[PDB]
Amino acid sequence: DPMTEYKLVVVGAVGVGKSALTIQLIQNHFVDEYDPTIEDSYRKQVVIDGETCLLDILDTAGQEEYSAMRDQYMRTGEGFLCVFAINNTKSFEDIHQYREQIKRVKDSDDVPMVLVGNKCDLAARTVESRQAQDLARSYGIPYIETSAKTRQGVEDAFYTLVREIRQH
Amino acid sequence: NTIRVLLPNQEWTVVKVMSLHDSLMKALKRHGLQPESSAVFKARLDWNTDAASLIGEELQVDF
Numbered sequence: 523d524p525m526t527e528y529k530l531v532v533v534g535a536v537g538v539g540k541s542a543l544t545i546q547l548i549q550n551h552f553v554d555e556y557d558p559t560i561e562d563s564y565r566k567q568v569v570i571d572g573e574t575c576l577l578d579i580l581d582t583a584g585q586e587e588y589s590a591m592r593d594q595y596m597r598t599g600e601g602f603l604c605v606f607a608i609n610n611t612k613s614f615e616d617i618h619q620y621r622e623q624i625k626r627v628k629d630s631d632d633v634p635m636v637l638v639g640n641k642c643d644l645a646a647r648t649v650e651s652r653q654a655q656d657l658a659r660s661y662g663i664p665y666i667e668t669s670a671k672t673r674q675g676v677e678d679a680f681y682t683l684v685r686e687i688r689q690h
Numbered sequence: 691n692t693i694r695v696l697l698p699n700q701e702w703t704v705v706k707v708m709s710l711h712d713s714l715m716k717a718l719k720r721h722g723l724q725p726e727s728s729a730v731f732k733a734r735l736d737w738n739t740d741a742a743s744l745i746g747e748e749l750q751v752d753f
């Protein structure tokens with residue numbers, strides 16, 4: 523009864539860390555290998571600020587051959603984590619596409635979203651923070667840098683998205 | 691092709707096609723489940739069953 527359910531969706535490219543970020547959040551261990559996820563849904567009960575929250579999370583597939591049914595995954599979720607790798611310029615350029623697909627399927631200029639720059643444990647980043655900052659400023663959403671291996675800002679990213687939903 | 695399956699706590703997962711335990715091995719460990727403590731399903735089948743047999747039909751899994 524005093525528990526709220528948040529349906530979260532993680533979208534992005536193929537090799538960014540949609541699964542590593544989610545798996546690090548749930549089981550607190552980073553998957554060094556790479557098994558591309560088709561579709562996965564997880565649930566976790568956490569305490570954000572004051573309330574107890576049940577979080578339904580959807581790990582979509584970045585590959586467009588399986589992202590043909592992307593309208594279905596978007597049509598149900600109430601919040602979206604848009605993930606790019608800071609060593610993948612293409613994944614960052616593809617964020618524009620996803621936001622349009624989200625803003626289309628939900629028919630709104632304001633949707634609870636958070637821009638996440640993943641793989642911030644590496645050096646020689648092809649995408650600077652200031653770039654990803656300006657994009658999030660254009661969308662009106664916050665930007666948080668994460669590292670699934672380091673667990674840096676991984677909690678901050680997800681919890682900020684829930685706050686973005688809860689503060690809608 | 692592809693076959694979707696349900697998990698506890700209103701969770702689920704889809705995997706492609708072999709041994710049903712070998713096809714769902716990585717995802718079970720990903721989702722947090724040992725294949726000995728659980729088995730497929732409202733009618734249970736064997737773990738060594740061919741995965742490509744139940745293509746198109748969706749199953750459930752509990753401990």
Ligand SMILES: Nc1nc2c(ncn2[C@@H]2O[C@H](COP(=O)(O)OP(=O)(O)NP(=O)(O)O)[C@@H](O)[C@H]2O)c(=O)[nH]1
Pocket residue numbers: 534535536537538539540541542543553554555556557558559560582583584585640641642643644668669670671672
């Ligand atoms: N150094 C580092 N490597 C990472 C990080 N996140 C993921 N990786 C690695 O980069 C790859 C990304 O894998 P994965 O987590 O499946 O990304 P994904 O976007 O979910 N793939 P898909 O959606 O197609 O299933 C893997 O080889 C993983 O080990 C991170 O924060 N740091």
Ligand SMILES: [Mg+2]
Pocket residue numbers: 540541542557558559
């Ligand atoms: Mg994945």
